[PDB]
Amino acid sequence: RPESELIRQSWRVVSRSPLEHGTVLFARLFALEPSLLPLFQYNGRQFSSPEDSLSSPEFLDHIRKVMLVIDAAVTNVEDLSSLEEYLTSLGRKHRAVGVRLSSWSTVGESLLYMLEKSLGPDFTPATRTAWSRLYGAVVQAMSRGWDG
Ligand code: HEM
């Protein structure tokens, strides 16, 4: 598939420095949805501001975790059914931490933003549309952990 190679090529760029790029994703994410901030509760405490998150070692671990799950979705872009059950369950984890179903889309905007920024001119509108579908399948699946 063409799509699937696009994602794969585009992804490599980001895969190189996943902490740096995941950092973009999350900054963007809290800029768009600041009510995600207090969901992280490392050592009982809420981050006050977004910049506090970037100073938490646990938060930066979570970014790495995030980017590895995206990795997996990338490896498996042609057959993504194969991560469905993982992701549903990842979804239910997150419903427990308090993420709303609607926050998921914001994560996808944030994910595309992080890509658009990384790829600059390279973020072709085919590239865009492919990610949007990928990450979209990833939430159709993370979203699944809300059921019923
Ligand atoms: C949308 C906002 C998000 C918030 C507020 C959030 C928050 C959390 C929190 C508080 C935890 C548990 C603490 C921890 O392990 O650090 C967690 C776990 C995790 N998150 Fe997120 N998260 C978000 C999005 C995502 C996304 C997009 C992914 C991946 C695509 C992701 C992947 C993970 C994984 C892999 C874990 C470990 C889950 C496990 O116990 O198996 N998170 N997240």
Numbering used by the authors: 3 to 150
Sentences from the paper on this structure:
To investigate the correlation between mechanical properties and functional efficiency in proteins, we selected neuroglobin (Ngb), a hexacoordinated heme protein, which is expressed in the neurons of vertebrates and is involved in neuroprotection in hypoxic conditions and protects brain from stroke. Ngb folds like all globins with a bundle of eight helices termed A to H, and a heme hexacoordinated in both ferric and ferrous forms by the imidazole side chain of the distal and proximal histidines (His 64 and His 96 respectively). The structures of human and murine Ngb present a large internal cavity behind the heme, that is connected to the surface through a tunnel, forming a pathway toward the heme for gaseous ligands (O2, CO, NO). Like many recently discovered globins, Ngb is characterized by endogenous heme iron hexacoordination in the absence of external ligands.
The effects of high-pressure on the structure of the F106W mutant shed light on the role of Phe 106 and helix G. This mutant is endowed with an enhanced barrier to heme sliding, as indicated by decreased CO affinity. Between F106W HP-310 and F106W AP, the main segments affected by pressure are the BC and CD loops, the N-terminal segment of helices F and G, and especially the second half of helix H which is shifted by more than 1 Å toward helix G which carries the F106W mutation. The protein mean B-factors are considerably raised by pressure, which could explain why this mutant is more sensitive to pressure than WT Ngb. The residues whose B-factors present a relevant increase with pressure (more than 15 Å2) are mostly located at the back of the protein, while the residues whose B-factors are moderately increased by pressure (less than 5 Å2) are mainly located close to the heme. The effect of pressure seems to be the opposite of what was previously observed in WT Ngb under pressure. There is a shrinkage of its volume between the HP-310 and AP structures by 8%. In particular, the tunnel disappears already at 280 MPa and site I disappears at 310 MPa, while site II remains insensitive to pressure (data not shown). The force constant variation profiles between F106W HP-310 and F106W AP presents four peaks, three of them correspond to residues belonging to the WT mechanical nucleus, and one corresponds to Met 69, which lies away from the main cavity. The HP structures reveal that the flexibility of the extended FG loop is restrained by the presence of a tryptophan at position 106, with no particular flexibility of Val 99.
